[PDB]
Design a protein around this ligand. Structure first.
Ligand code: CL
Ligand code: CL
Ligand code: CL
Ligand code: NA
Ligand code: NA
Ligand code: NA
Ligand code: NA
Ligand code: NA
Ligand code: NA
Ligand code: NA
Ligand code: NA
Ligand code: NA
Ligand code: NA
Ligand code: NA
Ligand code: NA
Ligand code: NA
Length: 196
């Protein structure tokens, strides 16, 4: 299984299909797909766990990657059995997700806390508890609550997309610290990011 707070499972949240791939709610997929390409980790079909997954070496550590293919609000149907099967404790899990409560171009690493309204986290925390790490990728808020679906299922304008892409790129450079268990240093260096 996992070992302490070395990160050994990195999950990206999102919805499946081309119609959702460019939407804000897929920010976690963007991160994990880019990470997989950086390290040469194959993301392959994983029907057993209702997702796409991979396994490979990140900086001398054996790490698994997971993209649930359940639709966002059923993400736990992938993350929970996968983590349990591989004996990965929540403390060794990083979940990358879009964050309505932060601006595009802001990115933060957080440990613990609730779902903050996020319908994918809402499907995970009841089962494994809150004590996993989160890479909160700011996407902005549409103002009102009635609008949240339309915002998160929208494709950001180019300025916002550029800001998010830069923040994601910065976080990819800090995965080495996470897989090494240097969560405090990673948190400081991720949370310090600014776009300009
Ligand atoms: Cl959704
Ligand atoms: Cl935070
Ligand atoms: Cl459960
Ligand atoms: Na681990
Ligand atoms: Na998901
Ligand atoms: Na590949
Ligand atoms: Na490496
Ligand atoms: Na999904
Ligand atoms: Na399931
Ligand atoms: Na961002
Ligand atoms: Na979070
Ligand atoms: Na929108
Ligand atoms: Na977008
Ligand atoms: Na940028
Ligand atoms: Na550290
Ligand atoms: Na440390």
């Amino acid at each position: 299984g996992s070992h302490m707070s070395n990160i050994s499972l990195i999950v990206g949240l999102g919805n499946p299909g081309s119609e959702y791939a460019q939407t804000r709610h897929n920010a976690g997929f963007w991160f994990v797909e880019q990470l997989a390409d950086k390290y040469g980790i194959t993301l392959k079909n994983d029907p057993k766990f209702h997702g796409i997954s991979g396994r490979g070496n990140i900086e001398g550590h054996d790490v698994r990657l997971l993209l649930p293919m359940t639709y966002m609000n059923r993400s736990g149907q992938s993350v929970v059995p996968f983590s349990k099967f591989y004996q990965i404790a929540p403390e060794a899990i990083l979940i990358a997700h879009d964050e309505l409560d932060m601006n595009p171009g802001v990115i933060r690493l957080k440990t613990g806390g609730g779902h903050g309204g996020h319908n994918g986290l809402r499907d995970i925390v009841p089962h494994i508890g809150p004590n996993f790490h989160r890479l909160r990728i700011g996407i902005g808020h549409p103002g009102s609550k009635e609008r949240v679906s339309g915002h998160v299922l929208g494709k950001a304008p180019s300025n916002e997309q550029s800001l998010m892409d830069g923040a994601i790129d910065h976080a990819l450079s800090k995965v080495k610290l996470l897989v090494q268990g240097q969560v405090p240093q990673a948190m400081n260096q991720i949370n310090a990011y600014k776009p300009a």
